[PDB]
Amino acid sequence: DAINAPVTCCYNFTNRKISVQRLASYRRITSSKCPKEAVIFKTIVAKEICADPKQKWVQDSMDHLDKQ
Ligand SMILES: [K+]
Ligand SMILES: [K+]
Ligand SMILES: [K+]
Ligand SMILES: [K+]
Ligand SMILES: [K+]
Ligand code: NA
Ligand SMILES: [Sr+2]
């Protein structure tokens, strides 16, 4: 269940863009406990990075990853 599940949020967004070749996947932050809308990219070396879904590169990267 989710009632007592911990919730993961984003507070800081990466300043710099990440090339598609370095991205393995993403997930969205849905929880209304979180301060703002966010995307977490997991890179090809499993590092997790907060990114702002308002930014266009973030949107396009998400679409690309969705396809493969
Ligand atoms: K300069
Ligand atoms: K220039
Ligand atoms: K191209
Ligand atoms: K212009
Ligand atoms: K494209
Ligand atoms: Na140059
Ligand atoms: Sr640039």
Author numbering: 3 to 70
Sentences from the paper on this structure:
CCL2 (Monocyte Chemoattractant Protein-1; MCP-1) is a member of the CC-chemokine family, a group of small secreted proteins of 8–10 kDa that regulate leukocyte migration in the human body. CCL2 acts as a strong chemoattractant primarily for monocytes, but also for memory T cells and natural killer cells. Whereas other chemokines are able to bind and activate several members of the chemokine receptor family, which all belong to the group of G protein-coupled receptors, CCL2 binds with high affinity almost exclusively to chemokine receptor 2 (CCR2)2. Spiegelmers are chemically synthesized L-stereoisomer oligonucleotide aptamers, which are biologically very stable and immunologically passive because of their non-natural mirror-image conformation.
To gain a better understanding and to obtain structural details of how natural protein targets in the L-configuration are bound by non-natural oligonucleotides in the L-configuration, we crystallized the L-protein·L-oligonucleotide complex composed of L-CCL2 and the L-oligonucleotide part of NOX-E36. The structure was solved applying single-wavelength anomalous diffraction (SAD) and refined to 2.05 Å. An analysis of all contacts including symmetry-related molecules using the programmes Coot and PISA clearly shows that the complex is a stable dimer of two CCL2·L-aptamer complexes, which are connected through interaction of two CCL2 molecules. The NOX-E36 L-aptamer forms a heavily distorted hairpin structure, whose exterior shell is rod-shaped with a length of 4.5 nm and a diameter of 2.5 nm. Remarkably, the loops forming the target-binding site are interconnected by two base pairs in parallel strand orientation (C4-G22 and the noncanonical GG N7-N1 carbonyl-amino base pair G5-G24), forming a mini pseudoknot. A protruding patch of mostly basic and polar amino acids of CCL2, that is, amino acids 17–24, inserts into this pocket. The bivalent ion Sr2+ interconnects three residues (C9, C11 and A12) belonging to the binding region of the L-aptamer. The L-aptamer binds directly to Arg24 and Lys49 and thus shields an essential part of the CCL2 receptor-binding region, blocking CCL2's interaction with its receptor CCR2. Since the L-oligonucleotide forms at least three hydrogen bonds with each of the amino acids Arg18, Lys19 and Arg24 and one hydrogen bond with His66 and Lys49, respectively, almost the complete GAG-binding region of CCL2 is covered by the L-aptamer.
